[PDB]
UniProtKB/Swiss-Prot annotation:
It is found in: Cell inner membrane. Keywords: Cell inner membrane, Cell membrane, Cytochrome c-type biogenesis, Disulfide bond, Membrane, Redox-active center, Transmembrane, Transmembrane helix. Belongs to the thioredoxin family. DsbE subfamily. Residues 9-147 form the Thioredoxin domain. This is Thiol:disulfide interchange protein DsbE. GO terms for cellular component: outer membrane-bounded periplasmic space; plasma membrane. It is a single-pass membrane protein. Changing C53S: Drastic decrease in activity. The gene is dsbE. Involved in disulfide bond formation. Catalyzes a late, reductive step in the assembly of periplasmic c-type cytochromes, probably the reduction of disulfide bonds of the apocytochrome c to allow covalent linkage with the heme. Possible subunit of a heme lyase. DsbE is maintained in a reduced state by DsbD. Residues 1-153 are periplasmic.
Amino acid sequence: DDPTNLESALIGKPVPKFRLESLDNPGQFYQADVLTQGKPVLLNVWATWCPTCRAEHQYLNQLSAQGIRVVGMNYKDDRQKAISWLKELGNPYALSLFDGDGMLGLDLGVYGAPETFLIDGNGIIRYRHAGDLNPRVWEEEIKPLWEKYSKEA
């Protein structure tokens, strides 16, 4: 029927509202609208304290380079560390929101990381996977959803 588990929260509803500064370019702020752009996007919860986050990063670059749109959700992290991080490993993201308060994660039902949402063009959350992004997950679970909500263009 309808899944009742905490990983199924927000499935089928609009991204929570927020206002967060960009980690990449200080001074610039963003809101739910940035994830509501008429095309599907991936939102990827990450932080320097997240132990499996490095393990998923290079495949994050790979998708980013084939035109899969990815927005960073830097979760309760240390600003300077996060910067140093993106610098050594590469920057896959359109931008990372600096959720240094943890408010947005909290709004999204996030506990620990990394985690990846597929949000459609209308800002609606369609899928949520806890754990590392990799070619299996992509090919099996996410790719069909990305095509589904891209063809709605």
